[PDB]
Please model this.
Amino acid sequence: VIAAVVSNFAQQILDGIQEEAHKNGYNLIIVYEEQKHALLTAIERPVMGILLLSIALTDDNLQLLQSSDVPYCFLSMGFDDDRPFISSDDEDIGYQATNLLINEGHRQIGIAGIDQYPYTGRKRLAGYKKALKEANIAINQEWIKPGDYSYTSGEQAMKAFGKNTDLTGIIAASDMTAIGILNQASSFGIEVPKDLSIVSIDGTEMCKITRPQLTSISQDFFQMGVTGVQQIHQSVKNGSNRIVSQQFIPVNPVIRKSTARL
Amino acid sequence: SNVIAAVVSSVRTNFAQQILDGIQEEAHKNGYNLIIVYHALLTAIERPVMGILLLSIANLQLLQSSPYCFLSMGDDRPFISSDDEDIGYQATNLLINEGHRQIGIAGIDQYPYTGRKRLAGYKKALKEANIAINQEWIKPGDYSYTSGEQAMKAFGKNTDLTGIIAASDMTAIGILNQASSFGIEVPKDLSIVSIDGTEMCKITRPQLTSISQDFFQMGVTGVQQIHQSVKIVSQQFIPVNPVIRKSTARL
Model:
């Protein structure tokens, strides 16, 4: 029995876990202080492994999971330390998203909705700034509008940029953030991709339901889930009952209808 | 043990999430712990759990042994859910009360306890409006976005329908996007009433008018029922009501 800890991208990871699990004959329970109790809820009952779907554990909750001697691995999130994880290369996500617009002729490129403090956001933003520097585009703090990856932060950031923004391209922190940017731009009378290109990060089904459909840097969440279960399975096989690997799952741009050459 | 199990298997919408939020809040209020399973029953049974909630699922014999309550699906079985027949009824009447008579319904599954009941509420409204039930106006599906697109393609660019009832918000969006690709303006050329009323209705353009369900309450009341039986035969219907947005207009 494998336990997955969760706080659209999750379902995609869960489907992958569910498949790899039922391929190993494993069972799966999803554990929804809310944190500390989530860990205990999973450990209290006998489980062979724990997968944490983009969960930022506190310092003590982490030592807690590490002391239970239960094989574990984080999914869709990277770390600075040696904690085991499987996710995308966040810096490369920001790098690819930005270059996608640069290669389409854009130079006044903004980025919105990213929670700039944590590891995830820090890396994606660094990738964005690298892409700009390699294109000899001066980093403009006004082109960076932080948020929390939500739909609202997308709407708020677009308001910040303004109806008369000089930006011609914007990278969204997430698909929901991209939809907010998209709708707010629309309210300002800004046509996408006509006078504004938008590149979304994640590439879940949400990208195929907006008009225009969102071009994105898609993460292979499914594979994260598949690999995650393979690390647990491998931890019981080699008898170590422990996971220490950190891996990056490649991402790929999926061109839809929200981008156009400058 | 103080853990409640919630059984939810593959869903094409965000409805479960809505119900879970309710379960969570009412669970925390009692120190309860929540786990979720997608066979599924055994995983929950072999695990000493306080109670089980089945969010729109259809093995109960195995269940009876082991305290359970069905959520979002409605005859001895305990349950908390919307009146699916009334949903179909209200959805259709919202359009009939706006002058529409050529109304279609898409995305509903032809299964007995939920889909059939909505289709029934639909046929009921057409009957009272003395509208001839037309089979070509019913396009079965699985409540998904894709089912919405395909059902609209089936209705056709040259559809004579002026209003369409979608099985879910996701299906509603599929219908809206496909209609638009056909050059069919909503609500100018076509009215769309969505069922569920989740935030999905707020991020679409035009925003989707809907027959909204109180999924949250269903989750809260599910936990309340668990906390009571251990301190279940109850059958409760959580009311639904329309929320007018920008996807409908008088004929």
